[PDB]
Amino acid sequence: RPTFYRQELNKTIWEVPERYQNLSPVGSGAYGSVCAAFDTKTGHRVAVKKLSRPFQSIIHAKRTYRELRLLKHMKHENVIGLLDVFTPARSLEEFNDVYLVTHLMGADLNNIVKCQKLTDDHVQFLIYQILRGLKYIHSADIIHRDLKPSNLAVNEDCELKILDFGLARHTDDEMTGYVATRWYRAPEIMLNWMHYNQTVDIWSVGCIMAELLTGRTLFPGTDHIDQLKLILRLVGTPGAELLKKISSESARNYIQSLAQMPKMNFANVFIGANPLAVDLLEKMLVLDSDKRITAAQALAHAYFAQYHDPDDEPVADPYDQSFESRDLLIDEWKSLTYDEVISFVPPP
Ligand SMILES: CCS(=O)(=O)NCc1ccc2c(c1)OCO2
Ligand SMILES: [Cl-]
Ligand SMILES: [Cl-]
Ligand SMILES: [Cl-]
Ligand SMILES: [Cl-]
Ligand SMILES: [Cl-]
Ligand SMILES: [Mg+2]
């Protein structure tokens, strides 16, 4: 067991191992509080997150367990991983606080698409890395659910990591109106058309790639219905085959109320873009999620010929998510989480 020291930072007690020095507040959401620190064991600048009220309800205790299982599993160059997890508790009986440690992220994709000139070579390398990370995530039957520029960390050498997995967190208020939180979402999940799957993340990659090529948001809708009209004007209205797959009768009735529109010519929308970029966008931005290109298929597309290496695009170890259908008490979820904290083995 390491030695811990205590300090109060912005009205919050932090109790951490001595290896973590020079802590300074960097933000606080409803998920918890975050400090920057120097890790004397590794020599890295790190983010330390102290979870807020991790075991306050069955819902919160299960969310804490889900987040810790997912972070312990992800071991890939293009995905956020766990450097450390700790509690100051010496037994299950006194266990209340959880702290997560990751590499400290600098810029996101928002702070390079807004303020930089990107070559086609930059767009190839950035989208290649997102798809390399997604092939790995999808191989474990994990859906990200919230890919957008603020969830992509990028360094001076244009190297990218995926972070901030959707842990079923987002509220109705957060998805209402003129908001970036909804602009990257697939139409089948934005309007609850059907049981969604991993294809929703490929729609999001389409919206991100378009914005890197033009410097503008592809579908900046003022509400759910405005955004659907922007989507259908580009990709066309649905045919009978997709309409049969929409499970809501009322959603089917609303779609049928709209005048029929054909798919637009994407070379006349993405003026001057690499023809291979245009071709890949037409394969991602497909309304019927059964017919979208997969991450594994997209890595083999001629747009990425410069970067593609089929011997260096790894898949994940098997991931057991059977806990998701399990009905447990607060203290049972808390005991499972305790065991995951004490069994953690740091990376090399
Ligand atoms: C695994 C679900 S997640 O990707 O949403 N976790 C977010 C997170 C945010 C800040 C952090 C952190 C973890 O550890 C230190 O600072
Ligand atoms: Cl220590
Ligand atoms: Cl990492
Ligand atoms: Cl504790
Ligand atoms: Cl964003
Ligand atoms: Cl597993
Ligand atoms: Mg985020």
Short mmCIF file of C-alpha atoms and ligand atoms in Angstrom, two decimals:
data_model
loop_
_atom_site.label_atom_id
_atom_site.label_comp_id
_atom_site.label_asym_id
_atom_site.label_seq_id
_atom_site.Cartn_x
_atom_site.Cartn_y
_atom_site.Cartn_z
CA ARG A 1 0.00 0.00 0.00
CA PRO A 2 1.44 3.45 -0.86
CA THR A 3 1.42 6.38 1.60
CA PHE A 4 -1.43 8.90 0.96
CA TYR A 5 -1.56 12.65 1.75
CA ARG A 6 -4.69 14.90 2.01
CA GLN A 7 -5.38 18.44 0.74
CA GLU A 8 -8.46 20.63 0.06
CA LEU A 9 -8.72 21.94 -3.56
CA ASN A 10 -11.78 24.15 -4.50
CA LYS A 11 -13.97 22.91 -1.58
CA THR A 12 -13.07 19.16 -2.17
CA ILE A 13 -10.81 16.81 -0.07
CA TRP A 14 -8.24 14.94 -2.27
CA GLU A 15 -6.45 11.92 -0.68
CA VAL A 16 -3.84 10.53 -3.17
CA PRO A 17 -0.59 8.50 -3.22
CA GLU A 18 2.68 10.53 -2.74
CA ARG A 19 3.78 9.69 -6.38
CA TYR A 20 1.15 12.33 -7.59
CA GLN A 21 2.49 15.91 -7.06
CA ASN A 22 1.56 19.57 -7.90
CA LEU A 23 -2.26 18.89 -8.26
CA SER A 24 -4.24 21.79 -9.90
CA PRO A 25 -8.01 21.90 -10.61
CA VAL A 26 -8.83 21.65 -14.38
CA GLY A 27 -12.67 21.14 -14.30
CA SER A 28 -15.76 19.58 -12.60
CA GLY A 29 -18.90 18.04 -14.22
CA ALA A 30 -21.65 15.92 -12.54
CA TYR A 31 -19.46 12.76 -13.07
CA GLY A 32 -16.74 14.16 -10.71
CA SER A 33 -13.82 16.66 -10.27
CA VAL A 34 -10.52 16.56 -12.30
CA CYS A 35 -6.95 17.78 -11.40
CA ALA A 36 -3.75 17.92 -13.52
CA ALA A 37 -0.73 16.37 -11.71
CA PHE A 38 2.87 15.18 -12.26
CA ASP A 39 3.31 11.39 -11.82
CA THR A 40 6.83 10.83 -10.30
CA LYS A 41 6.75 7.03 -11.06
CA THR A 42 6.19 7.44 -14.86
CA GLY A 43 7.37 11.04 -15.54
CA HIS A 44 4.02 11.78 -17.37
CA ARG A 45 1.63 14.73 -16.80
CA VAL A 46 -1.69 12.99 -15.81
CA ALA A 47 -5.43 13.67 -15.24
CA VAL A 48 -6.76 12.48 -11.82
CA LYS A 49 -10.59 12.19 -11.57
CA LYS A 50 -12.29 11.85 -8.16
CA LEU A 51 -15.75 10.34 -8.80
CA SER A 52 -18.72 12.23 -7.19
CA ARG A 53 -21.23 10.11 -5.16
CA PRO A 54 -20.16 6.85 -6.91
CA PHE A 55 -22.49 4.56 -4.77
CA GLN A 56 -25.45 6.99 -4.06
CA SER A 57 -28.08 4.87 -5.98
CA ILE A 58 -28.30 1.46 -7.74
CA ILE A 59 -28.08 3.42 -11.06
CA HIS A 60 -24.90 5.36 -9.93
CA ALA A 61 -23.20 2.23 -8.39
CA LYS A 62 -23.77 0.26 -11.67
CA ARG A 63 -22.49 3.27 -13.76
CA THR A 64 -19.26 3.39 -11.58
CA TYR A 65 -18.73 -0.40 -12.21
CA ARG A 66 -19.39 -0.02 -16.03
CA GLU A 67 -16.90 2.90 -16.38
CA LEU A 68 -14.12 1.03 -14.44
CA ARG A 69 -14.63 -2.28 -16.42
CA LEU A 70 -14.50 -0.39 -19.77
CA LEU A 71 -11.36 1.70 -18.88
CA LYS A 72 -9.47 -1.43 -17.57
CA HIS A 73 -10.18 -3.26 -20.88
CA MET A 74 -9.11 -0.63 -23.51
CA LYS A 75 -5.43 -1.21 -24.55
CA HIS A 76 -4.85 0.43 -27.99
CA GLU A 77 -2.66 3.37 -29.29
CA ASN A 78 -5.80 5.27 -30.60
CA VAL A 79 -8.06 4.81 -27.48
CA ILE A 80 -7.83 6.30 -23.92
CA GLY A 81 -6.45 3.75 -21.38
CA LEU A 82 -6.17 3.56 -17.58
CA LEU A 83 -2.73 4.44 -16.02
CA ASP A 84 -3.97 3.82 -12.40
CA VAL A 85 -7.05 3.45 -10.14
CA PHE A 86 -6.90 3.88 -6.32
CA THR A 87 -8.89 4.28 -3.10
CA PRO A 88 -7.58 5.50 0.28
CA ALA A 89 -9.82 2.77 1.91
CA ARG A 90 -7.97 -0.12 3.71
CA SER A 91 -11.11 -2.45 3.61
CA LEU A 92 -14.50 -2.90 1.80
CA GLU A 93 -16.22 -1.71 5.03
CA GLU A 94 -14.64 1.82 4.78
CA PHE A 95 -14.73 1.99 0.88
CA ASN A 96 -16.45 5.19 -0.45
CA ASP A 97 -14.08 7.02 -2.88
CA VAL A 98 -12.75 6.03 -6.36
CA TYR A 99 -9.97 7.89 -8.25
CA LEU A 100 -9.10 7.24 -11.96
CA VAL A 101 -5.76 8.28 -13.60
CA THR A 102 -5.09 8.80 -17.37
CA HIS A 103 -2.54 10.66 -19.60
CA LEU A 104 -3.28 14.43 -19.58
CA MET A 105 -4.85 15.42 -22.95
CA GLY A 106 -3.92 18.80 -24.57
CA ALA A 107 -5.86 19.87 -27.66
CA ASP A 108 -9.07 18.29 -29.05
CA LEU A 109 -10.04 18.16 -32.78
CA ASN A 110 -12.23 21.28 -32.13
CA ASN A 111 -8.94 23.25 -31.49
CA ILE A 112 -7.46 22.29 -34.95
CA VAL A 113 -10.53 22.23 -37.19
CA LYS A 114 -11.46 25.82 -36.09
CA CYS A 115 -7.85 27.21 -36.05
CA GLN A 116 -5.63 25.51 -38.72
CA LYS A 117 -5.31 24.82 -42.50
CA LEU A 118 -5.49 21.00 -43.06
CA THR A 119 -4.08 19.29 -46.19
CA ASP A 120 -5.83 16.19 -47.61
CA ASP A 121 -2.81 14.28 -46.07
CA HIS A 122 -3.90 15.56 -42.57
CA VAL A 123 -7.55 14.44 -43.21
CA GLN A 124 -6.30 10.96 -44.38
CA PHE A 125 -4.12 10.51 -41.19
CA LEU A 126 -6.73 11.80 -38.68
CA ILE A 127 -9.64 9.72 -40.10
CA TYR A 128 -7.33 6.63 -40.48
CA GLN A 129 -6.56 6.78 -36.69
CA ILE A 130 -10.30 7.12 -35.69
CA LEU A 131 -11.15 4.01 -37.85
CA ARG A 132 -8.11 2.02 -36.43
CA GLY A 133 -9.44 2.79 -32.86
CA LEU A 134 -13.07 1.91 -33.89
CA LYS A 135 -12.08 -1.46 -35.49
CA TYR A 136 -10.58 -2.34 -32.01
CA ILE A 137 -13.62 -1.00 -30.00
CA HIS A 138 -16.21 -2.74 -32.28
CA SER A 139 -14.24 -6.11 -32.17
CA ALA A 140 -15.18 -6.18 -28.40
CA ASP A 141 -18.94 -5.52 -29.15
CA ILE A 142 -18.60 -1.98 -27.62
CA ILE A 143 -20.53 1.00 -29.21
CA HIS A 144 -18.98 4.47 -28.49
CA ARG A 145 -22.35 6.34 -29.04
CA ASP A 146 -20.85 9.92 -28.68
CA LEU A 147 -18.07 10.45 -31.30
CA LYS A 148 -17.65 14.20 -32.01
CA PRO A 149 -14.63 16.56 -32.26
CA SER A 150 -14.51 17.47 -28.46
CA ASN A 151 -14.16 13.62 -27.75
CA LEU A 152 -10.95 13.30 -29.92
CA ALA A 153 -7.52 14.31 -28.41
CA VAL A 154 -4.80 15.34 -30.91
CA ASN A 155 -1.08 16.26 -30.29
CA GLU A 156 1.55 18.38 -32.20
CA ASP A 157 2.46 15.31 -34.38
CA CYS A 158 -1.27 14.87 -35.45
CA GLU A 159 -1.58 11.63 -33.32
CA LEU A 160 -5.17 11.00 -32.14
CA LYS A 161 -6.95 9.23 -29.24
CA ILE A 162 -10.67 8.44 -28.81
CA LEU A 163 -12.11 9.31 -25.35
CA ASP A 164 -15.33 9.92 -23.32
CA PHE A 165 -17.31 6.77 -24.21
CA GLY A 166 -21.12 7.23 -23.88
CA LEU A 167 -21.94 5.35 -20.59
CA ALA A 168 -25.76 5.87 -21.31
CA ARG A 169 -25.30 9.37 -19.71
CA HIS A 170 -26.94 12.05 -22.02
CA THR A 171 -30.24 13.76 -20.98
CA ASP A 172 -33.23 15.16 -23.04
CA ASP A 173 -32.29 18.82 -22.17
CA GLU A 174 -28.66 18.14 -23.37
CA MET A 175 -29.93 17.02 -26.90
CA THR A 176 -32.45 19.97 -27.37
CA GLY A 177 -32.01 22.91 -29.81
CA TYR A 178 -28.89 24.29 -31.62
CA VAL A 179 -26.35 21.96 -29.87
CA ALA A 180 -23.16 20.13 -31.04
CA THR A 181 -24.15 17.23 -28.72
CA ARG A 182 -26.82 16.16 -31.42
CA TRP A 183 -25.11 17.24 -34.76
CA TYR A 184 -22.95 14.01 -35.08
CA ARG A 185 -25.72 11.44 -34.10
CA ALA A 186 -27.18 8.86 -36.59
CA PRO A 187 -30.86 9.56 -37.44
CA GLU A 188 -32.05 6.07 -36.16
CA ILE A 189 -30.79 6.93 -32.60
CA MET A 190 -31.68 10.72 -32.71
CA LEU A 191 -35.41 9.84 -33.36
CA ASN A 192 -35.50 6.28 -31.74
CA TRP A 193 -36.50 4.55 -35.10
CA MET A 194 -35.24 1.05 -34.11
CA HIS A 195 -32.77 -1.02 -32.02
CA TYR A 196 -29.42 0.60 -33.00
CA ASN A 197 -25.98 -1.13 -33.23
CA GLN A 198 -22.25 -0.26 -33.85
CA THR A 199 -23.07 1.30 -37.33
CA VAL A 200 -24.15 4.53 -35.47
CA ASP A 201 -20.41 5.30 -34.86
CA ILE A 202 -19.64 5.15 -38.70
CA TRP A 203 -22.35 7.88 -39.30
CA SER A 204 -20.52 10.07 -36.73
CA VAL A 205 -17.15 9.50 -38.50
CA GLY A 206 -18.84 10.67 -41.79
CA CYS A 207 -20.01 13.96 -40.12
CA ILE A 208 -16.45 14.52 -38.65
CA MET A 209 -14.63 13.79 -41.99
CA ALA A 210 -17.01 16.23 -43.91
CA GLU A 211 -16.25 19.01 -41.32
CA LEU A 212 -12.42 18.45 -41.63
CA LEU A 213 -12.75 18.80 -45.47
CA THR A 214 -15.03 21.98 -45.52
CA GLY A 215 -14.25 23.60 -42.09
CA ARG A 216 -18.09 23.71 -41.47
CA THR A 217 -20.55 21.47 -39.50
CA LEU A 218 -22.34 19.09 -41.94
CA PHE A 219 -25.80 18.99 -40.21
CA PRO A 220 -26.08 21.97 -37.78
CA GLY A 221 -29.81 21.58 -37.06
CA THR A 222 -31.76 24.05 -34.77
CA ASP A 223 -33.78 21.03 -33.36
CA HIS A 224 -34.37 17.25 -34.07
CA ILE A 225 -36.81 17.99 -37.04
CA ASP A 226 -34.65 20.71 -38.69
CA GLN A 227 -31.65 18.33 -38.46
CA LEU A 228 -33.62 15.44 -40.07
CA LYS A 229 -34.59 17.81 -43.03
CA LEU A 230 -30.87 18.72 -43.50
CA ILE A 231 -29.96 14.97 -43.47
CA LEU A 232 -32.69 13.87 -45.97
CA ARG A 233 -31.88 16.75 -48.40
CA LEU A 234 -28.30 15.32 -48.71
CA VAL A 235 -28.88 11.48 -48.63
CA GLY A 236 -32.50 11.40 -49.99
CA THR A 237 -35.80 10.26 -48.36
CA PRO A 238 -36.12 6.57 -47.36
CA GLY A 239 -37.49 3.84 -49.71
CA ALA A 240 -39.94 1.03 -48.69
CA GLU A 241 -37.09 -1.33 -47.61
CA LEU A 242 -35.83 1.07 -44.84
CA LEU A 243 -39.42 2.22 -43.94
CA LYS A 244 -40.29 -1.45 -43.00
CA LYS A 245 -37.36 -1.42 -40.45
CA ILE A 246 -38.71 1.62 -38.51
CA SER A 247 -40.55 0.05 -35.48
CA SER A 248 -42.49 3.22 -34.41
CA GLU A 249 -45.67 3.50 -36.58
CA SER A 250 -45.80 7.28 -35.76
CA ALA A 251 -42.13 7.76 -36.91
CA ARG A 252 -43.09 5.83 -40.15
CA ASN A 253 -46.20 8.08 -40.60
CA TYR A 254 -44.15 11.29 -40.08
CA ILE A 255 -41.46 10.20 -42.69
CA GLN A 256 -44.25 9.48 -45.28
CA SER A 257 -45.64 13.04 -44.76
CA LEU A 258 -42.42 14.51 -46.35
CA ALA A 259 -42.10 15.11 -50.17
CA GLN A 260 -39.74 12.54 -51.80
CA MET A 261 -36.16 13.82 -52.52
CA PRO A 262 -33.31 12.03 -54.36
CA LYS A 263 -29.71 11.65 -52.98
CA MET A 264 -27.56 14.72 -54.01
CA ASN A 265 -24.32 14.58 -56.04
CA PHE A 266 -21.56 14.63 -53.30
CA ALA A 267 -18.88 15.98 -55.79
CA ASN A 268 -21.12 19.14 -56.12
CA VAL A 269 -21.42 19.38 -52.25
CA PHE A 270 -17.69 18.71 -51.36
CA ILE A 271 -16.33 20.93 -54.17
CA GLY A 272 -12.62 20.29 -54.93
CA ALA A 273 -12.22 17.37 -52.46
CA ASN A 274 -10.11 14.27 -53.39
CA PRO A 275 -12.48 12.02 -55.42
CA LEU A 276 -11.47 9.09 -53.11
CA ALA A 277 -12.62 11.16 -50.04
CA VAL A 278 -15.98 11.82 -51.84
CA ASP A 279 -16.37 8.04 -52.56
CA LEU A 280 -15.73 7.07 -48.87
CA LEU A 281 -18.24 9.73 -47.60
CA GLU A 282 -20.96 8.22 -49.88
CA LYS A 283 -20.23 4.78 -48.21
CA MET A 284 -20.44 6.12 -44.58
CA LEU A 285 -23.42 8.53 -44.93
CA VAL A 286 -26.05 5.89 -45.89
CA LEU A 287 -29.47 6.22 -44.25
CA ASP A 288 -30.01 2.37 -43.89
CA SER A 289 -27.54 1.36 -41.13
CA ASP A 290 -27.43 -2.31 -42.53
CA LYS A 291 -25.72 -0.88 -45.72
CA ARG A 292 -23.05 1.46 -44.17
CA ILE A 293 -19.32 0.50 -44.57
CA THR A 294 -17.77 -1.04 -41.36
CA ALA A 295 -14.53 0.25 -39.72
CA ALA A 296 -12.62 -2.91 -40.91
CA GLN A 297 -13.91 -2.41 -44.54
CA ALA A 298 -13.07 1.37 -44.46
CA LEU A 299 -9.38 0.76 -43.42
CA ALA A 300 -8.91 -1.13 -46.79
CA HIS A 301 -10.38 1.81 -48.88
CA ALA A 302 -7.94 3.37 -51.40
CA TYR A 303 -8.24 6.78 -49.60
CA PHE A 304 -5.92 5.36 -46.82
CA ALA A 305 -3.38 3.56 -49.17
CA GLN A 306 -0.52 5.66 -47.63
CA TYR A 307 -1.23 4.47 -43.99
CA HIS A 308 -3.05 1.07 -44.19
CA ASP A 309 -1.03 -1.86 -42.72
CA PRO A 310 -3.18 -4.98 -42.19
CA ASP A 311 -0.49 -6.42 -39.80
CA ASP A 312 -0.74 -3.32 -37.49
CA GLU A 313 -4.57 -2.86 -37.09
CA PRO A 314 -5.16 -4.98 -33.97
CA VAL A 315 -8.43 -6.35 -32.46
CA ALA A 316 -9.40 -6.46 -28.75
CA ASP A 317 -9.46 -9.34 -26.24
CA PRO A 318 -12.97 -10.72 -25.63
CA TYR A 319 -15.09 -8.38 -23.34
CA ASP A 320 -17.74 -9.97 -21.00
CA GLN A 321 -20.71 -7.50 -20.60
CA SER A 322 -23.11 -10.06 -19.00
CA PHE A 323 -23.23 -7.74 -15.87
CA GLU A 324 -25.42 -5.32 -17.95
CA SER A 325 -28.50 -7.62 -17.63
CA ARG A 326 -27.84 -8.39 -13.92
CA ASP A 327 -30.12 -7.08 -11.11
CA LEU A 328 -27.99 -6.34 -7.96
CA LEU A 329 -28.16 -4.31 -4.67
CA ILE A 330 -26.01 -1.13 -4.13
CA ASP A 331 -23.59 -3.01 -1.82
CA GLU A 332 -23.17 -5.90 -4.41
CA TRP A 333 -22.17 -3.36 -7.20
CA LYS A 334 -19.86 -1.70 -4.62
CA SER A 335 -18.20 -5.05 -3.74
CA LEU A 336 -17.67 -5.84 -7.51
CA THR A 337 -16.07 -2.35 -7.99
CA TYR A 338 -13.78 -2.83 -4.90
CA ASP A 339 -12.47 -6.14 -6.39
CA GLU A 340 -11.74 -4.38 -9.77
CA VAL A 341 -9.76 -1.55 -7.92
CA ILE A 342 -7.59 -4.03 -5.90
CA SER A 343 -6.85 -6.36 -8.90
CA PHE A 344 -5.63 -3.52 -11.26
CA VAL A 345 -2.21 -4.20 -12.87
CA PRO A 346 -0.54 -1.08 -14.35
CA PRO A 347 0.70 -1.14 -17.97
CA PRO A 348 4.49 -1.68 -18.66
C1 LIG B 1 -14.51 5.20 -19.40
C2 LIG B 1 -15.60 6.17 -19.60
S1 LIG B 1 -14.98 7.66 -19.97
O1 LIG B 1 -14.10 7.57 -21.08
O2 LIG B 1 -16.15 8.48 -20.08
N1 LIG B 1 -14.14 8.24 -18.68
C3 LIG B 1 -13.91 9.70 -18.63
C4 LIG B 1 -12.78 10.24 -17.80
C5 LIG B 1 -12.68 11.62 -17.77
C6 LIG B 1 -11.68 12.29 -17.08
C7 LIG B 1 -10.77 11.51 -16.42
C8 LIG B 1 -10.86 10.10 -16.43
C9 LIG B 1 -11.86 9.41 -17.11
O3 LIG B 1 -9.83 9.59 -15.68
C10 LIG B 1 -9.07 10.72 -15.22
O4 LIG B 1 -9.69 11.91 -15.67
CL CL B 2 3.29 6.76 -3.83
CL CL B 3 -3.79 6.46 -23.17
CL CL B 4 -12.69 5.67 0.51
CL CL B 5 -17.84 18.68 -30.40
CL CL B 6 -14.09 -9.78 -20.05
MG MG B 7 -16.40 14.96 -23.90
#
